[PDB]
Design a protein around this ligand. Structure first.
Ligand SMILES: N#Cc1ccc(Cn2nccc2-c2cc(Cl)c3nnn(-c4ccc5cn[nH]c5c4)c3c2)cc1
Ligand SMILES: N#Cc1ccc(Cn2nccc2-c2cc(Cl)c3nnn(-c4ccc5cn[nH]c5c4)c3c2)cc1
Ligand SMILES: [Ca+2]
Ligand SMILES: [Ca+2]
Ligand SMILES: [Zn+2]
Ligand SMILES: [Zn+2]
Ligand SMILES: [Zn+2]
Ligand SMILES: [Zn+2]
Lengths: 514, 516
């Protein structure tokens, strides 16, 4: 018995086709992704193959003005038009609180929404009953396939789920669900969820009964053979994990932003054991036509976003690299621009820290350098503030160690900086990787970089998200000596670009590796 | 027979009293120098000692809006009121060309103006004839004292003396003059000139018959004992040179900007040989009152200078270090500010690299006056009225410019480069012309700018002053090897427009220049 799995993850409000770097589509002839194109490819597979499932591994919420304006209503409408079979909750599904998940998405979706490790309590428990499920048993031809869902246990530190939801350990909560399916004679089981590639391999190894793992969160690109675009593979597609019960478990992910459609063909025996598997993500480029009916519908919804002011805030003569491949791994000029904008607005304090997890999109310079509100909203969508904090040298050293404590997994805590020169040695054990930390003096007439002192006190400008312990920055929230509310994030950056008129941020050696 | 030599050098238009860093006077209670205070000190010494000479070793011209507006007429007027006995020509006396030296200074000074190594040719020979002299024999009581002048051989690369003036080697030109003085029965000889401390010491050692050397140009601070202010001594006052003809020759200098009055008391024998010498520069601080007559006259002349729009151009929240002790020796934030203003103004109407000679940065700016920056504060930093131009350069040409930048490091010369979009590391222990150990530059043929090592065979677009594109400060490799040269915007206007745009400025020392 053969099953075809079609899968998307971390679409992040890319409803329309985009530029290859997943920023706004300008040169339409070379544009990729979007739901209109995705529908054409999905229909080509469904008409050719008998047993097909279309799955989403979370983070459809947040990314463009489509979500700023429609707040998830666009997600339910277009995922329904594409006839997704199941979706697992991501951390971004909680960005507008529980109320912002229930009303636009859970009540309007015509497909099951899954998460086995999220438990509701108090008054909310009765209100959210049946709105999301731990699993779904789906008929596929004359057979049945069990799909078990999971969501990152880190969601309370990344989003707004509130106090009436408990995030259990993924492996602990998934085992009673898989066991229940096996007692119900469901021999084919897919683990679909949003925790990242490292947790996906752990679920494949330790959750007895799981046949295939379909994940997201880490924007992992897997490929077998010569890759078709700029994404570099982290391993082969699928990635094979040998479980603790000696079975080969395929693990898959399909990058992010709807650029690719994941495609895996599984050969099962009569007892639901995986005999073999093969496939690859499919690049959704201009050679695949956008579906005419979906496009016409996308255009109708686009009218409300078209009333947004298309006025030029300013110009860039350089590419503004806000890609996660850069800003979560190294110094990126978008990070330097925002940290310099933060310092400049406040002086109208020489040090700045900014998590890569907060930088959500790059900005292209080829459209006569024009920067609009729409371009900026995709970079800074959370509506947070840039606040003043007083920190000890020891707290600052702890935040920089946390910045790289699990380097290489594409996590949000990596820090972009202003008025700070940091050197990291990744060969050293976690918590002892900062080899050099020089900061700009304040008690000096002429500013210059001096070694950080553990017993000294520093004034830093950072997002209110980090002062509140976001991205696991617990040492900031617990040890800060002062915290003053600042100006709105996007407004600080638009004001800076308007004053400067022409911007040119560079990678100047603020972050170095040994 | 006893003689007291009072001496100034590199006053650089500091007519009014200044802040101790020699920028604008704001907190008057702590202000120093100025001609009014100098007059009180000179008057105190003249009434105490019968045999006194007041000498200037050049570079009175250029430094503040006093020179922008009065163009040397303030120099002649106030040097006459102080009754200077003689002055040697400096490089800055040629900033407004030969016509700018002849009309307001040579024609109005009531004292001799000297230089034994400058020779006139062409039609100027007849025009300038006798306006400046190789020497002057001065009566001092019952005796006579010979004073021979000299000017830096480097002046054509630093100023505008023109094609009709020839600069000879100092030692070659001075010896025939000193020998002539001996035949004229002049047994006491002072060499007064503007070539720097290293040349002053060579003059003392090799020019037979010279008794004392009074110099300038290098802003050298000499002192015996504990110094009274922030200047660090380069040696004792006086510095003693053992001459080739077997004598002890004192060499003196008195820093710059009229902050100090050089004071040297000499004991001569009957044949004009130095028996002994002692003194020190006198710090002209608040303990010496300003002469009321000179002060009133200074206030009268300042009326026309206030007409300069006192409108706040912008604000600084940091000290703007444009001092020579910094910008001629290491990375200074005033240099970073100017190079950033040069790149920003050019990108307004892709050029990522900037070079700027420390010799072009003429004053710091203080942040304590509510951070206010005016046209007067700026005109003291950039007074030459030059432009910031676009040039195309080979990687080899740029590497050579950075080698020339540190080829004779430690003499406080102007060729040291301040940078923008460049990361340079020097190792001074190495031979000259092989001191540049690291040179990284910002890419231009990239979507994201980043630092990459310089390539000898590569071609770069640099913003620099027109002065450097024309071989100023000895940058012959720039003038001779550049591939393109476009005219730019006025230097001072580029910096003021940037400050007005930014509103609040805070330049830092970031590690653009490093030493190994
Ligand atoms: N503890 C805590 C905590 C404090 C504040 C918030 C505020 N908040 N409510 C919903 C979304 C946001 C929000 C706001 C701002 Cl300004 C953010 N910058 N980055 N970032 C982000 C989002 C996703 C990932 C993935 N990995 N890292 C991430 C970081 C942001 C989330 C949330 C939680
Ligand atoms: N070769 C040649 C050459 C080319 C151009 C000029 C222009 N020029 N005419 C008079 C004064 C200036 C002038 C203009 C500008 Cl913008 C200058 N920046 N620095 N600097 C300077 C002056 C003094 C010292 C001492 N040491 N280094 C110096 C450098 C400047 C002089 C002069 C000569
Ligand atoms: Ca199975
Ligand atoms: Ca003698
Ligand atoms: Zn995501
Ligand atoms: Zn996620
Ligand atoms: Zn001088
Ligand atoms: Zn000079």
């Amino acid at each position: 018995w053969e099953l075809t799995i079609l899968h998307t993850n971390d679409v992040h409000s890319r409803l329309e086709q985009t530029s290859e770097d997943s920023s706004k589509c300008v040169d339409a002839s070379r544009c990729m992704g979007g739901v209109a194109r995705l529908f054409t490819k999905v229909q080509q597979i469904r008409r050719a193959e008998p047993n097909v499932l279309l799955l989403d591994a979370g983070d459809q919420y947040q990314g463009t003005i489509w979500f700023t304006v429609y707040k998830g209503a666009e997600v339910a409408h277009f995922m329904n038009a594409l006839r997704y079979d199941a979706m697992a909750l991501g951390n971004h599904e909680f960005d507008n609180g529980v109320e912002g998940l229930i009303e636009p998405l859970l009540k309007e979706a015509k497909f099951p929404i899954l998460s086995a490790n999220i438990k509701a309590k108090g008054p909310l428990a009765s209100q959210i009953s049946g709105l999301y499920l731990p699993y779904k048993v789906l008929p596929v031809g004359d057979e049945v396939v069990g799909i078990v869902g999971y969501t990152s246990k880190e969601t309370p530190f990344l989003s707004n789920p509130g106090t009436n939801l408990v995030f259990e350990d993924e492996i602990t909560a998934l085992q009673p669900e898989v066991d229940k399916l096996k007692t119900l004679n469901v021999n084919k089981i897919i683990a679909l969820g949003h925790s990242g590639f490292e947790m996906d391999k752990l679920i494949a190894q330790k959750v007895r009964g799981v046949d295939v793992v379909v994940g997201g969160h880490s924007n992992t690109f897997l490929y077998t053979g010569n890759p078709p675009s700029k994404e570099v593979p982290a391993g082969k597609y699928p990635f094979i994990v040998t479980s603790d019960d000696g079975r080969k478990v395929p693990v898959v992910q399909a990058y992010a932003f709807g650029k690719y459609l994941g495609y895996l063909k599984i050969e099962f025996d009569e007892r639901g054991n995986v005999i073999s598997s093969h496939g690859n993500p499919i690049l959704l480029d201009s050679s695949i036509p956008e579906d005419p009916s979906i496009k016409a519908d996308i255009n109708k919804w686009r009218i409300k976003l078209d009333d947004y002011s298309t006025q030029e805030l300013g110009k860039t003569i350089v590419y503004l690299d806000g890609s996660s491949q850069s800003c979560r791994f190294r110094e990126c000029n978008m990070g330097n621009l925002i940290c310099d904008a933060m310092i400049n607005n406040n002086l109208r304090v020489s040090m700045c820290i900014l998590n890569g997890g907060g930088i959500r999109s790059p900005i292209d310079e080829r459209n006569d350098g024009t920067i609009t509100w729409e371009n900026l909203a995709a970079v800074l969508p959370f509506g947070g503030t840039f606040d003043l904090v007083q920190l000890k040298g020891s707290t600052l050293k702890k935040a920089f160690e946390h910045s790289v404590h699990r380097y290489g997994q594409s996590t949000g805590e990596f820090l972009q900086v202003g008025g700070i020169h940091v050197v990291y040695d990744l060969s050293r054990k976690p918590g002892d990787r900062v080899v050099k930390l020089d900061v700009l003096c304040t008690k000096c007439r002429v500013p210059s970089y001096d070694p950080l002192k553990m017993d000294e006190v520093y004034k830093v400008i950072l997002p209110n998200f980090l002062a509140n312990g976001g991205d696991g920055f617990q040492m900031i929230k617990d040890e800060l000596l002062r915290h003053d509310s600042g100006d709105q994030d996007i407004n600080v950056v638009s004001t800076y670009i308007s004053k400067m008129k022409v911007i040119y941020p560079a990678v100047e050696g603020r972050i170095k590796f040994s």
